[PDB]
Amino acid sequence: LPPEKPKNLSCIVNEGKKMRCEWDGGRETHLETNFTLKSEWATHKFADCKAKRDTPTSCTVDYSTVYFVNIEVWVEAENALGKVTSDHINFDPVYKVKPNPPHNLSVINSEELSSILKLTWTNPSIKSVIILKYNIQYRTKDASTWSQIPPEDTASTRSSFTVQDLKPFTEYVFRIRCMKEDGKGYWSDWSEEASGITYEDRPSKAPSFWYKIDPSHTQGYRTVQLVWKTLPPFEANGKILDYEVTLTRWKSHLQNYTVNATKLTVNLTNDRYLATLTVRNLVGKSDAAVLTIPACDFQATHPVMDLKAFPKDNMLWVEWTTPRESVKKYILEWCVLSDKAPCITDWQQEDGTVHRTYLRGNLAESKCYLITVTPVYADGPGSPESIKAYLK
Amino acid sequence: CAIRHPCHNNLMNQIRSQLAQLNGSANALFILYYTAQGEPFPNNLDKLCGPNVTDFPPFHANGTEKAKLVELYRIVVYLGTSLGNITRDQKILNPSALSLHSKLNATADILRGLLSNVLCRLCSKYHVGHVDVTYGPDTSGKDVFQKKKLGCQLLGKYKQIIAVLAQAF
Amino acid sequence: VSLIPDTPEILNLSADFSTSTLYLKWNDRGSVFPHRSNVIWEIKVLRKESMELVKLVTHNTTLNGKDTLHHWSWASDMPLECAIHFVEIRCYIDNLHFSGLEEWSDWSPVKNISWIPDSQTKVFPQDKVILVGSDITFCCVSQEKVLSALIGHTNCPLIHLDGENVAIKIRNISVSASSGTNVVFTTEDNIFGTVIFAGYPPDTPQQLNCETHDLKEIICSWNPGRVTALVGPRATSYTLVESFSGKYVRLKRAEAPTNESYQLLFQMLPNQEIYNFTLNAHNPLGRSQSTILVNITEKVYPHTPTSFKVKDINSTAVKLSWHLPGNFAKINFLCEIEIKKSNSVQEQRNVTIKGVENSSYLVALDKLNPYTLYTFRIRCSTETFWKWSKWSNKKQHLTTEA
Ligand SMILES: *[C@@H]1O[C@H](CO)[C@@H](O[C@@H]2O[C@H](CO)[C@@H](O)[C@H](O)[C@H]2NC(C)=O)[C@H](O)[C@H]1NC(C)=O
Ligand SMILES: *[C@@H]1O[C@H](CO)[C@@H](O[C@@H]2O[C@H](CO)[C@@H](O)[C@H](O)[C@H]2NC(C)=O)[C@H](O)[C@H]1NC(C)=O
Ligand SMILES: *[C@@H]1O[C@H](CO)[C@@H](O[C@@H]2O[C@H](CO)[C@@H](O)[C@H](O)[C@H]2NC(C)=O)[C@H](O)[C@H]1NC(C)=O
Ligand SMILES: *[C@@H]1O[C@H](CO)[C@@H](O[C@@H]2O[C@H](CO)[C@@H](O)[C@H](O)[C@H]2NC(C)=O)[C@H](O)[C@H]1NC(C)=O
Ligand SMILES: *[C@@H]1O[C@H](CO)[C@@H](O[C@@H]2O[C@H](CO)[C@@H](O)[C@H](O)[C@H]2NC(C)=O)[C@H](O)[C@H]1NC(C)=O
Ligand SMILES: *[C@@H]1O[C@H](CO)[C@@H](O)[C@H](O)[C@H]1NC(C)=O
Ligand SMILES: *[C@@H]1O[C@H](CO)[C@@H](O)[C@H](O)[C@H]1NC(C)=O
Ligand SMILES: *[C@@H]1O[C@H](CO)[C@@H](O)[C@H](O)[C@H]1NC(C)=O
Ligand SMILES: *[C@@H]1O[C@H](CO)[C@@H](O)[C@H](O)[C@H]1NC(C)=O
Ligand SMILES: *[C@@H]1O[C@H](CO)[C@@H](O)[C@H](O)[C@H]1NC(C)=O
């Protein structure tokens, strides 16, 4: 039972340590064998690699590795009957070098720019011998699949790189590995992950808000209630500091408030007014919305017809026919009719083009909800309508 | 030359990279040597570690490639012998240092590799068959201070000649 | 009358340039003076054109009116290769039975020695080893003017000599490093220097005790005291010698990264039963020694048993059999076998076993329970109380139950 040629002659070199070459086993041959690896500089040879009997996997070399010097390596196996040698290869140990991953990755944010970030790292000690190429993958704070950076950019030895086209106030994680430039060689391990954070340039388009009014409290004096929703932590682009709303009309009123909360109670007159809400951040130059409060006595002003709300499925879908030619927006309200207790209402804003949508709240089962749709026009809201509908 | 099997073809780029690495390692080794030698040495470098040796193989840049390779072979043989002697002397005198010995061993290994490469190239290209090499005495002994001074001057001359050879080839 | 002694003559003068000392010899003309009168000899050592550096006196007496040679030596503080040195002698006889006045005799004719340049070295001495704190003077002979000199980047002042030579007096030197401090003399275009070594005497080796693993050899170790600050060919060399027999072994300092404590091999001699060792230490500055007497029988340290099995016949429970190398065919053993129950208790018992050849041993047991998750462990001692042997690999081979 002569052992077959130990072919496939795999081999790998490691940076800072000695190299090692592999082979194929073949059949069991039911006999003990000792693989004797060889080395040849074409001028002078060295000691033969003796595979340890406990784990004869690759090799156990003893000479230091030198680059830019070819060497011929082959495997020699022999059992009690027969002798056979494997094939020979001539390779350069500088190509099989497996570099080390970069260390101490740093991330710093830019001033006034949220998309532009900076990435700095430290190249290993092998940068002086060979030319390194990098491969960087980035993802958000919570992502399953990483995003691949085009390798055409990081194709040369560089110490820093700048990332752009990024969303504001989004933390990102980076990692990098390096290998030889010409593509010949094994990739290095992945470096340590470094977190980062973008800037807080400016909030979103507009913090939409809706007004609430009571009837005449004391002979024409009515209280107004201003409420607005909280912008999610992806459009505000930074921590919310305070809200700022301005109101002025009728040649005499001009006020400004910096209430931290959403609810503020101010007593106004019967005359019309113009609302303007801004949300100030640590940077500034925020955006402004608008709202028109109607006058004292207004008629129905084009009420809504054909209102419906129904199950099927899992969310009450409201729908209505198209209103008249002039419609600004729809802001419908709803509450639950609880026995022996009043109801508090919620609200949401819809665009003028949309005629059917689903409400977003915390409704429960086996309850009756009174959904009221208030059509908002140019000169004030119109006569609303109500309808009851179960959940399940 | 008793060549076992034919050589590679990129020997020129190989020896160029080896000469660059040799220049770098020689600069680093010289810095380490004149830093770890002693206190009065760095202050009087211009007089103690001058690049003047009583015997050293000359080099001609205007010469042909064959003559340049022969001169490089002679120079690397002399440098290997002198580096072995200096390493022995430094291991005898100061056994505490380890980075210096590691750099010396790495430089000797790279010198032997360059020697093998240039011998392979010269025997595969021009078929010189045999070369003429002259061996000398220890040229440094019986005096500790003279040993130190000769070693530092030799390392300075080696740094200079390797900085010249890095641009020559 | 005036009694004037005869002018003495210097027979021969010599010097040892290695240790920088002088050798003087002369023969008094005692055959002329029959009386046994007391005499006094004064020798003045004058250098650098009659500077009168030191003056000595030696009191002697004529040996029954005979002429015998007297030798006198002196160690100079400055190397003899730095300047010229003159020497003259004179005597003054004092007769107890003389009535007239006694004066001093004339000085001997001048006898000088001058070192002729035979080597290329210009600074003296070369590689000298002295005690820390000793006073030494360095000299640099040359043909050109010297600018300055410095050892510990100090630039100490320099003194002048007769011909174009300078010297520096460095008092109370400091401790040197692994390499000697360079005593350089900055010339106009060259630098000549040497090295000096300042080390401490070898400390007495403490903690000198040794046991034995087998009755074939002894391994006696120790630890040095204060570091002598001398590394290389001038380091200390410890040597262990025997008192009664006289055999000796030498330790080797080949490899540089040495261990903390130095062991030493000493083969046991047949049937001695008594060992009285005496360790020696050598150094170019001093020496120390320390003796110790031990009883090799009681100073024994057994080895841990290896390659032992746990099995027996279907009869009463396992009779162990461990292998212990060495030569103990004369003394007995006290291997205590510790049996452990199912993580509940662990009883102790010991049985005596006579020594055997370099092979395994045999023992017996008594009424061990069934499996009960039993485990085995052994640690051998000796009838002579000492450190117990190291534990071996625990085995839990159980004889069949039910
Ligand atoms: C990365 O920064 C750390 C400091 O946070 C440093 O790590 C030192 O690395 C050296 C050698 O690798 C060690 O001897 C030190 O113990 C490490 N820690 C410190 C605090 O110095 C170093 O500046 C950088 N290390 C790398 C590998 O890039
Ligand atoms: C010192 O000793 C030397 C001896 O080496 C003296 O030199 C001798 O001088 C006399 C006359 O001057 C000559 O006749 C001898 O031949 C010399 N001996 C030699 C050259 O070996 C020298 O005079 C003594 N004194 C001094 C001051 O040097
Ligand atoms: C020789 O010099 C050393 C130090 O240069 C002196 O050692 C000092 O001695 C004083 C008191 O004697 C101590 O207070 C210092 O702490 C010592 N310093 C050191 C570094 O040991 C030594 O005394 C000097 N010798 C003489 C005879 O004066
Ligand atoms: C070892 O035997 C000697 C007998 O020669 C004991 O006596 C010592 O002998 C040495 C000889 O160099 C002397 O230096 C010691 O002073 C002697 N010691 C005594 C107490 O007389 C020696 O004692 C024995 N060793 C021990 C440890 O007792
Ligand atoms: C050195 O050790 C031996 C062995 O332990 C001692 O010899 C023992 O002497 C006692 C007498 O007190 C006998 O009862 C033992 O049988 C002896 N053991 C033997 C012969 O193996 C010897 O006495 C010790 N030396 C000293 C000075 O105490
Ligand atoms: C063996 O060859 C195959 C190619 O089919 C591949 O797994 C590799 O190159 C070799 N593997 C080993 C372990 O030698
Ligand atoms: C390995 O096996 C071969 C079989 O030819 C044998 O000659 C050799 O002694 C064994 N051991 C070693 C270390 O090679
Ligand atoms: C609010 O208005 C008052 C009116 O005098 C003015 O002083 C103040 O600066 C204003 N605050 C902001 C934040 O505009
Ligand atoms: C009230 O405003 C302050 C800032 O003046 C700040 O603590 C926060 O915006 C508000 N407080 C709370 C408890 O939300
Ligand atoms: C409430 O409105 C009334 C108007 O009649 C007046 O007291 C004032 O404007 C408001 N008071 C408070 C405390 O807001």
mmCIF file of N, CA, C and O in Angstrom, chain B residues 37-41 43-44 47-48 92-96 142-146 148-149, chain C residues 121 127 151 153 178-180 182 184 186-189 191-195 231-232 256:
data_model
loop_
_atom_site.group_PDB
_atom_site.id
_atom_site.type_symbol
_atom_site.label_atom_id
_atom_site.label_comp_id
_atom_site.label_asym_id
_atom_site.label_seq_id
_atom_site.Cartn_x
_atom_site.Cartn_y
_atom_site.Cartn_z
ATOM 1 N N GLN B 37 25.910 53.078 22.624
ATOM 2 C CA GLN B 37 27.338 52.875 22.853
ATOM 3 C C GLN B 37 27.766 53.419 24.211
ATOM 4 O O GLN B 37 28.273 52.678 25.062
ATOM 5 N N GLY B 38 27.570 54.716 24.434
ATOM 6 C CA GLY B 38 28.005 55.336 25.669
ATOM 7 C C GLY B 38 27.711 56.820 25.740
ATOM 8 O O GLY B 38 27.130 57.389 24.812
ATOM 9 N N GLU B 39 28.099 57.454 26.846
ATOM 10 C CA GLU B 39 27.825 58.879 27.020
ATOM 11 C C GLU B 39 28.742 59.778 26.195
ATOM 12 O O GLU B 39 28.228 60.684 25.518
ATOM 13 N N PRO B 40 30.073 59.616 26.205
ATOM 14 C CA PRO B 40 30.923 60.563 25.462
ATOM 15 C C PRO B 40 30.858 60.411 23.949
ATOM 16 O O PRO B 40 31.454 61.235 23.243
ATOM 17 N N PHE B 41 30.166 59.401 23.427
ATOM 18 C CA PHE B 41 30.160 59.153 21.988
ATOM 19 C C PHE B 41 29.262 60.123 21.218
ATOM 20 O O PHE B 41 29.722 60.709 20.230
ATOM 21 N N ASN B 43 28.333 63.111 21.844
ATOM 22 C CA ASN B 43 28.798 64.493 21.881
ATOM 23 C C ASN B 43 29.952 64.728 20.915
ATOM 24 O O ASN B 43 30.075 65.824 20.355
ATOM 25 N N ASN B 44 30.801 63.723 20.706
ATOM 26 C CA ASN B 44 31.957 63.860 19.829
ATOM 27 C C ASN B 44 31.847 62.919 18.636
ATOM 28 O O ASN B 44 32.818 62.238 18.287
ATOM 29 N N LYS B 47 34.283 63.195 15.517
ATOM 30 C CA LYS B 47 35.648 62.715 15.692
ATOM 31 C C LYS B 47 35.722 61.233 16.031
ATOM 32 O O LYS B 47 36.699 60.570 15.668
ATOM 33 N N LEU B 48 34.715 60.695 16.720
ATOM 34 C CA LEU B 48 34.774 59.303 17.151
ATOM 35 C C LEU B 48 34.221 58.352 16.094
ATOM 36 O O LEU B 48 34.771 57.264 15.891
ATOM 37 N N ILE B 92 29.761 40.363 23.607
ATOM 38 C CA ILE B 92 30.716 40.168 24.693
ATOM 39 C C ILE B 92 30.716 41.368 25.634
ATOM 40 O O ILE B 92 30.757 41.212 26.861
ATOM 41 N N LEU B 93 30.654 42.582 25.081
ATOM 42 C CA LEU B 93 30.808 43.780 25.901
ATOM 43 C C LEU B 93 29.528 44.169 26.633
ATOM 44 O O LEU B 93 29.576 44.467 27.832
ATOM 45 N N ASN B 94 28.386 44.176 25.948
ATOM 46 C CA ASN B 94 27.121 44.634 26.526
ATOM 47 C C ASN B 94 26.037 43.610 26.230
ATOM 48 O O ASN B 94 25.344 43.686 25.208
ATOM 49 N N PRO B 95 25.856 42.627 27.115
ATOM 50 C CA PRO B 95 24.807 41.621 26.912
ATOM 51 C C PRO B 95 23.412 42.086 27.300
ATOM 52 O O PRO B 95 22.453 41.333 27.096
ATOM 53 N N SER B 96 23.270 43.294 27.848
ATOM 54 C CA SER B 96 21.960 43.762 28.290
ATOM 55 C C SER B 96 21.074 44.162 27.116
ATOM 56 O O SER B 96 19.864 43.915 27.137
ATOM 57 N N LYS B 142 42.038 43.558 21.435
ATOM 58 C CA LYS B 142 43.000 43.840 22.497
ATOM 59 C C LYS B 142 42.787 45.201 23.154
ATOM 60 O O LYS B 142 43.411 45.497 24.178
ATOM 61 N N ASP B 143 41.881 46.012 22.610
ATOM 62 C CA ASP B 143 41.594 47.348 23.127
ATOM 63 C C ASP B 143 40.090 47.567 23.064
ATOM 64 O O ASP B 143 39.505 47.519 21.980
ATOM 65 N N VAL B 144 39.470 47.826 24.218
ATOM 66 C CA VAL B 144 38.023 48.018 24.257
ATOM 67 C C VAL B 144 37.638 49.328 23.577
ATOM 68 O O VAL B 144 36.688 49.381 22.781
ATOM 69 N N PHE B 145 38.362 50.407 23.883
ATOM 70 C CA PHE B 145 38.053 51.699 23.279
ATOM 71 C C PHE B 145 38.302 51.679 21.776
ATOM 72 O O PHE B 145 37.513 52.236 21.003
ATOM 73 N N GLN B 146 39.397 51.048 21.343
ATOM 74 C CA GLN B 146 39.652 50.927 19.912
ATOM 75 C C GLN B 146 38.592 50.066 19.239
ATOM 76 O O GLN B 146 38.177 50.359 18.113
ATOM 77 N N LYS B 148 35.413 49.842 20.174
ATOM 78 C CA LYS B 148 34.223 50.681 20.059
ATOM 79 C C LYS B 148 34.372 51.700 18.934
ATOM 80 O O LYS B 148 33.457 51.885 18.118
ATOM 81 N N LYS B 149 35.525 52.372 18.874
ATOM 82 C CA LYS B 149 35.731 53.403 17.862
ATOM 83 C C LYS B 149 35.726 52.811 16.458
ATOM 84 O O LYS B 149 35.095 53.363 15.546
ATOM 85 N N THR C 121 49.758 52.146 22.560
ATOM 86 C CA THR C 121 48.878 52.709 23.576
ATOM 87 C C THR C 121 49.470 53.994 24.143
ATOM 88 O O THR C 121 50.675 54.087 24.391
ATOM 89 N N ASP C 127 42.365 48.828 31.237
ATOM 90 C CA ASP C 127 41.405 47.853 31.759
ATOM 91 C C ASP C 127 41.704 47.485 33.212
ATOM 92 O O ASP C 127 41.746 46.309 33.578
ATOM 93 N N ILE C 151 35.711 62.207 31.945
ATOM 94 C CA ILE C 151 35.271 60.823 32.108
ATOM 95 C C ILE C 151 33.747 60.728 32.208
ATOM 96 O O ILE C 151 33.099 60.105 31.365
ATOM 97 N N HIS C 153 31.400 63.082 31.706
ATOM 98 C CA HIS C 153 31.003 64.382 31.156
ATOM 99 C C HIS C 153 31.151 65.492 32.197
ATOM 100 O O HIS C 153 30.250 66.302 32.425
ATOM 101 N N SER C 178 27.803 48.509 32.859
ATOM 102 C CA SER C 178 28.263 47.256 32.266
ATOM 103 C C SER C 178 29.540 47.463 31.460
ATOM 104 O O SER C 178 30.420 46.596 31.442
ATOM 105 N N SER C 179 29.656 48.604 30.788
ATOM 106 C CA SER C 179 30.869 48.978 30.076
ATOM 107 C C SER C 179 31.635 50.025 30.875
ATOM 108 O O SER C 179 31.048 50.831 31.601
ATOM 109 N N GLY C 180 32.958 50.002 30.737
ATOM 110 C CA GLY C 180 33.787 50.937 31.472
ATOM 111 C C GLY C 180 33.627 52.360 30.972
ATOM 112 O O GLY C 180 33.405 52.611 29.788
ATOM 113 N N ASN C 182 34.633 55.936 29.711
ATOM 114 C CA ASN C 182 35.699 56.331 28.799
ATOM 115 C C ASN C 182 36.453 57.529 29.362
ATOM 116 O O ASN C 182 35.857 58.579 29.626
ATOM 117 N N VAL C 184 38.688 59.941 28.053
ATOM 118 C CA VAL C 184 39.149 60.438 26.762
ATOM 119 C C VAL C 184 39.955 61.710 26.965
ATOM 120 O O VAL C 184 39.736 62.476 27.911
ATOM 121 N N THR C 186 40.756 64.857 24.657
ATOM 122 C CA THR C 186 40.441 65.539 23.407
ATOM 123 C C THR C 186 41.672 66.281 22.902
ATOM 124 O O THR C 186 42.109 67.265 23.509
ATOM 125 N N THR C 187 42.236 65.810 21.794
ATOM 126 C CA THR C 187 43.368 66.465 21.158
ATOM 127 C C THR C 187 42.814 67.437 20.113
ATOM 128 O O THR C 187 41.603 67.667 20.037
ATOM 129 N N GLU C 188 43.685 68.030 19.294
ATOM 130 C CA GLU C 188 43.225 68.989 18.294
ATOM 131 C C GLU C 188 42.432 68.303 17.187
ATOM 132 O O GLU C 188 41.437 68.852 16.700
ATOM 133 N N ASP C 189 42.855 67.106 16.775
ATOM 134 C CA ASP C 189 42.180 66.395 15.700
ATOM 135 C C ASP C 189 41.955 64.916 15.981
ATOM 136 O O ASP C 189 41.437 64.216 15.105
ATOM 137 N N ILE C 191 41.156 61.693 19.260
ATOM 138 C CA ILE C 191 40.638 61.400 20.592
ATOM 139 C C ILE C 191 41.196 60.054 21.031
ATOM 140 O O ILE C 191 40.945 59.033 20.380
ATOM 141 N N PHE C 192 41.948 60.048 22.128
ATOM 142 C CA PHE C 192 42.498 58.831 22.706
ATOM 143 C C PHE C 192 41.870 58.602 24.073
ATOM 144 O O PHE C 192 41.794 59.530 24.886
ATOM 145 N N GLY C 193 41.423 57.375 24.322
ATOM 146 C CA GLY C 193 40.752 57.069 25.571
ATOM 147 C C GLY C 193 40.863 55.606 25.934
ATOM 148 O O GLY C 193 41.189 54.754 25.100
ATOM 149 N N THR C 194 40.588 55.325 27.206
ATOM 150 C CA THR C 194 40.563 53.975 27.751
ATOM 151 C C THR C 194 39.321 53.820 28.621
ATOM 152 O O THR C 194 38.495 54.730 28.730
ATOM 153 N N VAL C 195 39.190 52.654 29.249
ATOM 154 C CA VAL C 195 38.055 52.358 30.112
ATOM 155 C C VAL C 195 38.566 51.920 31.477
ATOM 156 O O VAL C 195 39.627 51.299 31.598
ATOM 157 N N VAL C 231 30.304 42.285 34.521
ATOM 158 C CA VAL C 231 29.755 41.308 33.589
ATOM 159 C C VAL C 231 30.763 41.084 32.472
ATOM 160 O O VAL C 231 31.376 42.035 31.974
ATOM 161 N N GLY C 232 30.936 39.823 32.081
ATOM 162 C CA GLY C 232 31.855 39.470 31.027
ATOM 163 C C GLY C 232 32.940 38.527 31.504
ATOM 164 O O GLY C 232 32.708 37.643 32.333
ATOM 165 N N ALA C 256 24.050 34.017 28.439
ATOM 166 C CA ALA C 256 23.927 35.295 29.141
ATOM 167 C C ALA C 256 22.650 35.394 29.969
ATOM 168 O O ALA C 256 22.740 35.747 31.158
#
